[PDB]
Amino acid sequence: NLGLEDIIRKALMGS
Amino acid sequence: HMLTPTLVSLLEVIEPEVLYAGYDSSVPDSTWRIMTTLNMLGGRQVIAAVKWAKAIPGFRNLHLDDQMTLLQYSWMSLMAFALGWRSYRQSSANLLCFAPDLIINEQRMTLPDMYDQCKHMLYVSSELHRLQVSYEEYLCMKTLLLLSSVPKDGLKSQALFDAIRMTYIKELGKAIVKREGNSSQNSQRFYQLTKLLDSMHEVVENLLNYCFQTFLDKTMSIEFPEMLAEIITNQIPGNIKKLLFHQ
Amino acid sequence: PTLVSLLEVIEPEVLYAGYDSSVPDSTWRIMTTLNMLGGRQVIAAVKWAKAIPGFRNLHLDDQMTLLQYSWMSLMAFALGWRSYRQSSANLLCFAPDLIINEQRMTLPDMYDQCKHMLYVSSELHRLQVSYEEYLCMKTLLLLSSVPKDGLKSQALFDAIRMTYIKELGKAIVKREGNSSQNSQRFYQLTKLLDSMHEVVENLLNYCFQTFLEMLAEIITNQINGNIKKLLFHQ
Ligand SMILES: CC#C[C@]1(O)CC[C@H]2[C@@H]3CCC4=CC(=O)CCC4=C3[C@@H](c3ccc(N(C)C)cc3)C[C@@]21C
């Protein structure tokens, strides 16, 4: 449900 | 416009495909548990590495797409390096301390499921043990690792990045001087420590090469490895330029 | 503070794997794999619901509400049917690649729940239900429970349910047979449908004893007062 770069992106902002 | 006869024909149509559990007979229960548990722990460690990176002085002032990029190039390097350290300090002799509740002994890492990989993670652990690296030395080193890989087309905040990187290199000097003295210039410890960093490029490249050579081994895999496949999305240059302290 | 003081302050506490050697690898795998699969099924069950003729036209909230009350009913029923069609209704066939047999099912970790899951299965088998009949029944499950305090578009909902009750009537007839046999069969399948409330309450009871976060999110948001349970027979 969340690609690696998606996790990094989400973390950089708000999960 | 289109059409289908009965209401059942329609309920029949919208009825969804069968979902697989992703359950392979071949993989033993123990191999699945350990590799499943690491993958989800890995995921959590990435979140934590980013949060951390966002706390790093200097770096956090870099433009966000730079933070992103750097994070994307270095997360494995970072995590692998911290695993080296956790292990180094929870050891004496040759474990991988993935977590407090998940420490793998030498005999476990011998098995074919573990062997190819743990070679490269132990390499980092044993080197920290060889150079008896201090916490200050490691903290600086780990930060340097975040700033160790850059895209060839420039970062958007290159001058900041450059001065950021310098600062942390000077901070490493201060770390070595905390441990050694400064009646010396500590040139060899700086060469030795930087060289370990330079080598993390190799421990990462070997780890990623393993992941590609294991992803391909999953022909027909009823349990598809998107974990080992997503690892190929965020890592696959080529823009990535490795910054080496020693050519 | 020094740069290295900061660097040391902001180091993240070391994460746990959540690993636990008191749990056999056997159980961990089976239940981890189950939980992931179940996760994907719920989602698929929501997407299906959305496509169901009539349901779609209900108020946006009613759809969320009806789904809250039915997902387990849908998921168990489906699993009963897949099991019926894959194993003659005696293995539980969560997925094609994941068949838990009679010997595993009997163990204490899995016994209580699987009794209730196998019931669904064994009973479709016994009633020799068909796909057209099965597909009607499952859409009726989606309309098995309502807010005692009413859905927003209730007369629409009644018409919709009434339409699928009829379609099950047509499904029964498509097999043919006496006008007594079809009344026997309507009774039988409608009794089955009704008995899903108790297999649900039981399968959900075991799940409230997950708790004394994936399924955790839905489980706090559940814990049968306001939800009325539409019965065919009394
Ligand atoms: C044993 C083993 C193994 C591996 O497949 C190769 C390197 C491991 C990696 C190292 C770096 C690392 C350090 C840890 O402390 C636990 C996790 C971890 C891993 C594992 C991992 C798996 C998936 C992710 N994702 C999806 C972000 C992150 C980490 C498992 C890895 C990749």
Ligand SMILES: CC#C[C@]1(O)CC[C@H]2[C@@H]3CCC4=CC(=O)CCC4=C3[C@@H](c3ccc(N(C)C)cc3)C[C@@]21C
């Ligand atoms: C064996 C067993 C068991 C259980 O813990 C109780 C009932 C099972 C449920 C039935 C209904 C059901 C049908 C299936 O086909 C697989 C999954 C499934 C379950 C399992 C389940 C696990 C997690 C969720 N989430 C997070 C939405 C959903 C379903 C496992 C359940 C709950």
